[PDB]
Amino acid sequence: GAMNSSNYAELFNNDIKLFVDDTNVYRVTVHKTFEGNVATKAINGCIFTLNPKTGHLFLKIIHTSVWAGQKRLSQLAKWKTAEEVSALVRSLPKEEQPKQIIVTRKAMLDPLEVHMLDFPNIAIRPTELRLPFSAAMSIDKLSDVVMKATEPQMVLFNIYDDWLDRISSYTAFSRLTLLLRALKTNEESAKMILLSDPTITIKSYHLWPSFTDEQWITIESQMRDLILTEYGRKYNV
Amino acid sequence: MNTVPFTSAPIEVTIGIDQYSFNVKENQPFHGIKDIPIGHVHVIHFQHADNSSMRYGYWFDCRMGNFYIQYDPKDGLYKMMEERDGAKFENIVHNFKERQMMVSYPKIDEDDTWYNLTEFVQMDKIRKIVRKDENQFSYVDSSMTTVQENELSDPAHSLNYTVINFKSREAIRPGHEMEDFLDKSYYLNTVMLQGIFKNSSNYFGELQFAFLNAMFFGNYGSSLQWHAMIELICSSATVPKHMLDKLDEILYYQIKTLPEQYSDILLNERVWNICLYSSFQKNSLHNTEKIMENKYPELL
Numbered sequence: 001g002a003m004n005s006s007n008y009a010e011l012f013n014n015d016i017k018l019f020v021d022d023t024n025v026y027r028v029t030v031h032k033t034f035e036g037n038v039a040t041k042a043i044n045g046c047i048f049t050l051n052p053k054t055g056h057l058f059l060k061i062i063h064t065s066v067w068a069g070q071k072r073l074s075q076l077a078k079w080k081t082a083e084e085v086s087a088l089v090r091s092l093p094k095e096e097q098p099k100q101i102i103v104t105r106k107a108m109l110d111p112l113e114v115h116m117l118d119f120p121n122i123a124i125r126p127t128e129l130r131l132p133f134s135a136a137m138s139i140d141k142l143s144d145v146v147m148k149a150t151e152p153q154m155v156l157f158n159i160y161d162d163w164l165d166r167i168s169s170y171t172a173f174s175r176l177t178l179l180l181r182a183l184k185t186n187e188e189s190a191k192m193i194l195l196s197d198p199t200i201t202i203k204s205y206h207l208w209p210s211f212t213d214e215q216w217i218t219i220e221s222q223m224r225d226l227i228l229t230e231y232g233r234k235y236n237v
Numbered sequence: 238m239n240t241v242p243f244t245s246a247p248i249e250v251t252i253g254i255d256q257y258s259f260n261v262k263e264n265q266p267f268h269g270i271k272d273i274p275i276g277h278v279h280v281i282h283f284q285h286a287d288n289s290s291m292r293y294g295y296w297f298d299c300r301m302g303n304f305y306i307q308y309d310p311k312d313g314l315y316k317m318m319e320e321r322d323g324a325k326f327e328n329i330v331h332n333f334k335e336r337q338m339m340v341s342y343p344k345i346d347e348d349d350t351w352y353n354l355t356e357f358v359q360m361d362k363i364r365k366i367v368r369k370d371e372n373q374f375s376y377v378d379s380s381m382t383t384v385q386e387n388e389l390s391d392p393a394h395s396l397n398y399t400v401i402n403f404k405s406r407e408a409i410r411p412g413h414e415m416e417d418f419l420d421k422s423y424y425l426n427t428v429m430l431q432g433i434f435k436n437s438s439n440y441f442g443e444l445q446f447a448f449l450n451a452m453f454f455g456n457y458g459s460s461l462q463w464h465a466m467i468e469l470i471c472s473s474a475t476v477p478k479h480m481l482d483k484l485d486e487i488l489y490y491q492i493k494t495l496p497e498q499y500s501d502i503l504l505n506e507r508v509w510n511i512c513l514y515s516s517f518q519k520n521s522l523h524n525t526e527k528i529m530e531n532k533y534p535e536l537l
C-alpha cells in the first residue's frame with residue numbers, strides 16, 4: 001500500500017520502481033491586469049519521474065502550449081501527468097518497465113491508475129514521506145532546460161551524477177533528499193553552501209559539484225545545519 | 238388475489254411478505270397468506286426466533302404457478318415449493334380459508350408503496366440474477382455474495398448482478414481516460430444502457446431488486462450494487478430527462494420505505510453526499526434530496 005519509514009529500504013531493492021512528482025507540472029505567475037483584476041500566466045513545467053536505485057530521471061517538460069484553451073488546469077495537470085507517465089512506461093522495453101510507481105501526492109493515484117489499467121501488474125502507490133522533489137527546479141541545469149523548451153520534450157538525467165561509483169543508492173538518495181530539502185527550506189543559503197568555493201566545479205555532464213568524499217561530509221553537515229537552522233528561525237527555537 | 242399456503246409453522250419465526258412483518262409462535266396454527274395482489278412480484282422472507290442470523294426468503298410471482306411453504310426439519314428452514322396438481326392446491330387452499338387459518342395481505346387501498354418499489358422488477362430478470370432454473374421462484378439470503386464479490390466462492394449460490402467498476406477498461410475509453418472517469422456518460426449510456434441492459438427499465442429493475450435484497454436480507458453485496466447503480470447515473474453529465482425523473486421517484490420511495498433503525502447500515506454516506514451535493518445530477522433529484530434531508534440529515 002503506502003510507502004513510509006518502515007519500508008524505506010524497499011526503494012533500493014532490485015524491483016524496478018519510479019517515483020512520480022507532479023508539483024511542477026502546472027506552474028503560473030499571478031499578476032494584475034490593466035483593469036486591476038488578477039490573472040495567471042503559465043510557465044513551462046516538468047514531470048519529475050525518478051528511479052531511486054539508478055538515479056535515472058525522466059524529466060518530461062510540459063510546454064505552456066498544452067494548456068492553451070483548456071479549463072480546470074490544476075485538474076488537467078494531474079491527468080496530463082498520468083498520461084505522460086503511461087506513455088513513458090509503454091515506450092520502455094518490458095524488462096525495463098517498473099513494477100511499482102510511487103506518487104508523491106495522493107491526488108495522482110486515481111489519474112495514474114486509470115491511465116495504467118492496461119498494466120494491472122504495475123502497483124500504483126502513495127507515500128507518507130514528505131519528499132522534497134518540488135525543489136527539483138532549484139537545480140540550475142534542470143530549471144534551464146525547462147525554461148528554454150519551446151515544445152514538449154523528454155530529457156534524461158542521472159540525478160546522482162557519478163555518486164554510485166562510490167556510495168550505495170541508499171546513501172545517494174539520502175544525499176539527494178538532503179540537498180533538495182535544503183534547497184526547499186532556504187534556496188539561497190543552500191546554493192551558497194554548494195557553490196561558495198570556486199575551485200569545486202560542476203562537470204559539464206553533471207548536475208552537482210565534483211566534491212570529494214571528505215567535501216561531501218562537510219557539505220552534508222552544512223545542509224543539516226541549514227535545515228535545523230531555518231527550523232529555528234521559523235519556530236523561534 | 239392469490240395465496241401462498243403453509244403446511245404448518247413448526248418453529249417460531251418472523252414472517253415478512255413485502256414491507257409487512259408478523260410473528261408466528263412455535264407450532265401456532267398458521268397456514269399461510271392470502272389476498273396477495275396479482276400483478277406484482279412478491280417476496281416472502283423469514284428470520285427464525287432462535288437464530289436471528291441468516292434472514293432468508295423467496296421472490297415469486299403468483300401468476301407463474303401455485304407456490305406453498307413447508308418447514309424442512311433436516312435443512313432447518315421454511316422452503317418454498319410448487320404444487321403441480323392444480324386441483325389438490327385449490328382444495329388445500331379452500332380448506333385453510335374456510336377454517337380461517339391465513340393472514341390477509343394487508344394492503345391499504347391508497348397505498349402504492351409496493352408498486353413503487355417494484356415498478357421495473359420482473360421475475361424473468363430476477364431468475365437471471367439468482368440462478369436456480371428448476372424453480373419458478375428465487376431464494377435469497379443475507380450471506381449470498383455477488384459475482385463481483387467473488388472476483389475480489391460457491392458460484393451456484395451467488396447473486397449475478399451486472400458488474401459495474403469505475404476503474405475498468407470497460408468503463409474507460411482509451412484516450413478518454415480523464416473524460417470518461419470524471420463524466421461516466423459513456424459507461425452509463427453506451428456500455429450499460431445500450432450494451433448490457435438494452436433499456437432503462439431493465440437497469441432500474443436490477444437497481445430496485447438490489448435495494449430490496451439489501452433492505453430485506455441485509456445482503457451487503459446487494460447494498461453495494463444499489464449504490465453503484467445510483468452513482469453511475471449521478472456521475473454522468475448526460476442522462477435522459479425521463480431517467481432522472483424516474484430515478485428521483487424510485488429513490489424517493491426507497492428512502493421513504495427504508496426502516497429508520499437500519500438507515501446507518503443501508504445508506505453509504507459518501508455516495509449519497511456525492512450524488513446529492515457534488516455530482517452532475519446534484520440538482521436533479523428534488524424529491525429524493527428533500528426526503529433525505531428531512532429524514533436523515535445526520536448522514537449529510
Ligand SMILES: O=C(COc1cccc(F)c1)NC1CC1
Nearest residue numbers: 242243244305306320325326329
Ligand atoms: O407435502 C405435500 C403438501 O403439498 C401441499 C400443496 C399445497 C399446499 C400445501 F399446504 C401443501 N405434497 C407432497 C406430496 C408430499
Ligand SMILES: O=C(COc1cccc(F)c1)NC1CC1
Nearest residue numbers: 253256257452453454455496499
Ligand atoms: O423487514 C424489514 C427488516 O428487515 C431486516 C431485518 C434485519 C436486518 C435488516 F437489515 C433488515 N425491512 C423492510 C421494511 C420491511
